[model samples]
Target: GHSYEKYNNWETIEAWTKQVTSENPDLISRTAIGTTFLGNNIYLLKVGKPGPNKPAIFMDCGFHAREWISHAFCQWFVREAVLTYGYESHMTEFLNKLDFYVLPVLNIDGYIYTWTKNRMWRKTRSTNAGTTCIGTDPNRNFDAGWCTTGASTDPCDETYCGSAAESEKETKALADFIRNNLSSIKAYLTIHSYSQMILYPYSYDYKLPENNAELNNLAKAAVKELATLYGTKYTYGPGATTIYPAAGGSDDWAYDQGIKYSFTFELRDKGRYGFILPESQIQATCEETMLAIKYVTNYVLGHL
Candidate 1:
């Protein structure tokens, strides 16, 4: 709608899709799974490797509008996939072993609103009948562990669960994609910002999964690889104890669906800049994140 398509506004994402897909049409395709309440396209970028039957890994970001660091990280990932696919050995190796579905921006409406109006907007701007408050926390709107601990019932609250499971169109679209990819989807990762921590399942409560110890070991190794880039240490633990008990989260849903590797990364600065993490730190953040991400995905490739 807006005219400045080159700039980093709401429509810039659409412009980027056109450019990326046109350049690598054979390998890049966009899926308009659904439209947001505001009618913004929830785009999914599917990047395939040389072979068609490789295992799949799902990566999403910008679930929180203010978390701009997350936005940068996801874009960086897309850049790596699109440009370095065959040129870089490490990237080529990973692609040969796995398919990555990277959706850089998840909360389109909220993220757009943050860019244009409020820098700290946190939820989707969906209206309810006769109510002044707008938006439901998309993170909590998923069906898994809905309305449980770490969530609020009131629509006005920040962590309001939607009226029902997968109530939001975006959530439903994601749920459908995950369900469809369950067989080959060995890893699910949602990247967030402002908290330098690695989170795992059972966020509705503190209970650990049967493979909790194995997961913990992998997480530790991933963090070590992350530290190798710039020595960034991320506290890895259960979501309930490490940060807060976050319910209906994407990572846990994937874990429940039998994905051996499910994790959430809170990237960069630890809230020094909060959601407004500066663009200068983007390189370090991406470099460090790539290590952890590759470690997990490679592990999944071997085990899956």
Candidate 2:
């Protein structure tokens, strides 16, 4: 049976990931892309049949350790894909054409820390060279307009952009993997929480991407699709204007790297539950977000 109870720990997620791939060998596969700062294996789940050169979407969640919903959504996504592949025509067609690369948790060390020590831990668990503060905000440690606006220089700050871009081992591993597979990655989606919004690139500034019109249109449609279920509304626009200007975000970096269909989804309530969303709402959250994801992936497929 599907369970949201596994969202609180790293051990269950790690074992479940392997079990899913093992049980569904024909449609799903798991790969350890690299190791995190604390030697935790960073796993990526690949969903789809083997193809010569299939277009793909690279998605990840739990960039901030405290955002447990984001990680839960990733695991839910894979479960839905594998469990409904044949029965669901849309998903069947989707798997037949494109691939989905999903990372359930990006900040593995911090996520573990959240379970074991602090429930509000956000950054990685690695220590700096000289500073007493531990861990850099992985979201602000990417290479897109790194350490500019909407970022911090102090190591103790929550939004601290490390000493250099890709400073965190997890960030470097993700960047390197995406860079090497840039040609086939048509879309990039990173999930976050505490707000209901669908955001696009140029988060470091107010500038619009060259494909801003199309990206906006797709986001609009996705928000609409998402809203159809439970009438849960969502705001959509460029990150800088939609929310706030944040430098070194993964979405913007992916867009700058030539993945035109990049987006970041701030899922669920607008701070009602904050980071402690109840497990009871997990099913509804995952179902609605799945619709939005399908809407986006369908758009990517149509364009290609």
Candidate 3:
């Protein structure tokens, strides 16, 4: 388990990423996908055996900066992968065949700004050309059905879509990597918070994906695996119908890019503490979430 009990800052987590990859050379490796708006290195950890064009799952956290628990889950994920690789049979088998691309933090600038300036910042720290607002909602900055509904056009709104699709550097860089790696990547999972939902694509509208049945079944199985630990209930559905319609989400964009297994997880404590999740609950949250992720990963592996 990670020694750090409380929610940690960007520097600590960054160093931990490098150190863990260094320490666990056989199971994991790190690569720089790109830099953030503030020039911080956005590191991607590839966890699995070395192979060619292996089917992979690309996951990211901290799309919304103040959702600190989302970021914490990413860190916890890597920890479990590294620590349990050899000892856990299922994990060992999963790593032997499939690769896991884990991006611990996406909205780096806003995440840091949340700690320093505001505790509720939820966008990329990019300056809009004509407006004085600090950032654009990276989650709503993607190109899929962008700004159509469930998003704001105003620059100051929390769900503000950028001036154009992929307007923010962070979103463009992430989308570029996914596009380039489309041949091998089979699933896309983005972590968010406070809804206890496991959402599939078509978030831009109420329409369902062609493979909606399989995706929903996968979500059901994964959520069931999640519940085994603490009976943590999770609602699963197409994003637009399950929750509200949110255009330009990464999951929707990834699904449109043909990664049919794309999904989003809105984690822990429906609304009690909201973004300010207590540090004490981190272990339990990660523990159950790990089961859900592994269940999905195992399904991907079998399908591939």
Off by over 4 Å in 3: 1-4
lDDT of 2: 0.91
- lDDT sort, best first: 2, 3, 1
- lDDT (10s digit) by residue, model 3, range 1-304: 2454478889888888889898988878998888888899888899887887678899999899999999999988888887888799989888888889999899989999999999999988888788898789998889889999988998888999989999888888899999999999989999999889999989898888999999999999999999999999999999998988999999999999999899999999799999999999888998999999999988888897
Q: On residues 151-203, what C-alpha lDDT tens digit does candidate 1 reach at each position? A: 88777888988787788878888889889889888888999887888888778
Candidate 2 matches the true fold with a TM-score of 0.98
The candidate scoring highest on lDDT is 2
The residue-by-residue lDDT of candidate 2 on 1-304, one tens digit each, is: 4466446588888888888899988888889989999999999999997788888889999899999989999988988888899899999989999999999899999999999999899899888888899889998999999989899998998899998999999999999999999999999999998798999988997889999998999999999999999899999999999999999999999999999999999988888898888887888888899999999998899888
Cα lDDT listed for each candidate: 0.80, 0.91, 0.90
Predict model 3's lDDT versus the native.
0.90
- Estimate TM-scores for all models: 0.94, 0.98, 0.97
> Where is model 1 more than 4 Å wrong at Cα?
1-7
Of the candidates numbered 1 and 2, which has the greater TM-score value? 2
